[PDB]
Every structure is written in C-alpha cells, then in structure tokens.
Amino acid sequence: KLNDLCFTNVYADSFVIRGDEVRQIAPGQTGKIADYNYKLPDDFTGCV
Amino acid sequence: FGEVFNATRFASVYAWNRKRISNCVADYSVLYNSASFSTFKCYGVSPT
C-alpha cells in the first residue's frame, strides 16, 4: 500500500553495518548499534 | 558469574548442572555488554 499513499517527505537514513547486527534496526531494540549508534523511535513509521 | 560462564567443562544436557548463586552482588551489565554471546534473551524481565 505504499504506491497509493502521499507523504509530506521521506528521509533515507543510509549507512553500512555488521552482518548479524541488522535486526537491531527496529523500534524498541536494545544492544550495540541501537543504543550506541542508531535507534528508531517506538512510534516509527517507515521501511527498513 | 565467570566461574559458571568460563567454567572448563559444562555438564552434558541430560545431566545439566544447577549452580545456586546466592548472597552476592551480581552485575548483569557486563553480561549484556560482552559480545561473546550469540543469544542473550530474557523472559519476565529485561536485562537493562
């Protein structure tokens, strides 16, 4: 349903990370990259 | 905690061994700080 929604603007936060630390990129995740480098808000709306 | 975690030999799974930690001050912070663990996951509680 992304092709039929109109958003104000989109933010592409891009980077490169470890192989198996991917699933830290999600709301409420706790661990290395979540709490030291990059976390998502718990009301996060968007894609990874 | 180092004695049970860095023990020389863990018993085999059919005779798993149950150590009883008591009367002490545990610092679980260093446990979820160390990256030597593939899985570190809790129920009924949050490590934080």
Side-chain angles (χ1 to χ4, degrees), chain A residues 1-36 38-48, chain B:
Chain A
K1 289 183 175 294
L2 287 173
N3 300 286
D4 41 9
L5 292 174
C6 275
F7 312 100
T8 313
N9 60 23
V10 182
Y11 300 117
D13 309 332
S14 295
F15 49 76
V16 201
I17 63 174
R18 219 160 162 278
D20 52 322
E21 282 178 327
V22 148
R23 293 182 183 174
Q24 299 188 352
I25 305 304
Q29 292 300 279
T30 65
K32 162 59 181 284
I33 297 174
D35 281 328
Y36 291 149
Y38 184 86
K39 60 182 311 202
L40 305 167
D42 302 327
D43 57 7
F44 170 67
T45 289
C47 296
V48 180
Chain B
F1 274 53
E3 291 268 14
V4 175
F5 275 71
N6 296 333
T8 67
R9 167 178 184 291
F10 289 6
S12 62
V13 55
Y14 87 97
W16 49 271
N17 57 339
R18 161 166 292 197
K19 177 62 144 67
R20 181 177 65 83
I21 302 94
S22 157
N23 187 336
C24 59
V25 173
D27 190 356
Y28 318 86
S29 87
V30 303
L31 276 291
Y32 64 84
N33 247 10
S34 181
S36 309
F37 313 110
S38 187
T39 299
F40 178 97
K41 293 179 179 179
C42 309
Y43 308 108
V45 72
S46 46
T48 299

